[PDB]
Amino acid sequence: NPYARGPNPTAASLEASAGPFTVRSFTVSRPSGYGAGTVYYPTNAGGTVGAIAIVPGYTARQSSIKWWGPRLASHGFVVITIDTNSTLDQPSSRSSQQMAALGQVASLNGTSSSPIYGKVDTARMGVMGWAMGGGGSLISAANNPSLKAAAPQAPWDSSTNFSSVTVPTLIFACENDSIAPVNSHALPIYDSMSRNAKQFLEINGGSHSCANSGNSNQALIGKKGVAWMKRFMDNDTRYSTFACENPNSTRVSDFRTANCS
């Protein structure tokens, strides 16, 4: 597998605050098609890595999603967290801005002054995001089936039919979400998808912010997000059990998976 990076994973290595690779970051100097961005990247992955673009929720900023940047990059990904043009952008606009961010990561990969010059495999991309940014991730996946993985959290969308999504999709949900209640948003979205590898992981007692920066389940959520992205962005079957397994955890009130390998 030409995309395999890093040592053999363990539960311990995936639950730790940081993976094996050293992380650096920069502010996007000329954000093009979205508000602002921060790029996180490994300095020692030893080969090109895939890129992931992460979008916040309604009213929210990069701070809500920032923790994913170092957590994923330290496992061998280039991650761009964005601010949207407006904090009140809706899911469709969030998707357009997410894909703009992936395009700018591709531009920076081809720009000799950029810290990520030649670090990105632009054929291997993923999408993540919170709430309306999670709905935007699912729209991104529906419109761009060459995306390798999607892992939205507490997704919100007024349209829950994502039956056209063929991208491997992990939905993080928050049991006690009042803003994007699971029975109206995350679970109908999950149930709509009959064409893909998919997973539903609902955090016991979670509020709408249960997967955001500062959450108290970074060990499990980080392990699952990294394992999903490793399995499906890197085709890395070392991560098949971590990606597909039921955690069987007090921290997980509802687990479902289908077509997972």
UniProtKB/Swiss-Prot annotation:
Pathway: Xenobiotic degradation. Optimum pH is 9 for PET film hydrolysis. Optimum pH is 9 for PET (commercial drinking bottle) hydrolysis. Optimum pH is 6.5-8.0 for BHET hydrolysis. Optimum pH is 8.0 for the hydrolysis of pNP-esters. The enzyme is active at pH 6-10, has an optimal pH range of 7-9 and it is rapidly inactivated below pH 7.0 or above pH 9.0. Involved in the degradation and assimilation of the plastic poly(ethylene terephthalate) (PET), which allows I.sakaiensis to use PET as its major energy and carbon source for growth. Likely acts synergistically with MHETase to depolymerize PET. Catalyzes the hydrolysis of PET to produce mono(2-hydroxyethyl) terephthalate (MHET) as the major product. Also depolymerizes another semiaromatic polyester, poly(ethylene-2,5-furandicarboxylate) (PEF), which is an emerging, bioderived PET replacement with improved gas barrier properties. It catalyses: (ethylene terephthalate)(n) + H2O = (ethylene terephthalate)(n-1) + 4-[(2-hydroxyethoxy)carbonyl]benzoate + H(+); (2,5-ethylene furandicarboxylate)(n) + 2 H2O = (2,5-ethylene furandicarboxylate)(n-1) + 2,5-dicarboxyfuran + ethylene glycol + 2 H(+); an acetyl ester + H2O = an aliphatic alcohol + acetate + H(+); a butanoate ester + H2O = an aliphatic alcohol + butanoate + H(+). InterPro entries: AB_hydrolase_fold, FrsA_esterase, PET_hydrolase/cutinase-like. It is an enzyme of class 3 (hydrolase). It is found in: Secreted. Changing W156A: Exhibits highly impaired PET degradation capacity relative to wild-type PETase. Also displays decreased enzymatic activity on BHET. This is Poly(ethylene terephthalate) hydrolase. It holds the Pfam family PETase. Keywords: Disulfide bond, Hydrolase, Secreted, Serine esterase, Signal. Its EC number is 3.1.1.101. Poly(ethylene terephthalate) binds at Y58, M132, W156.
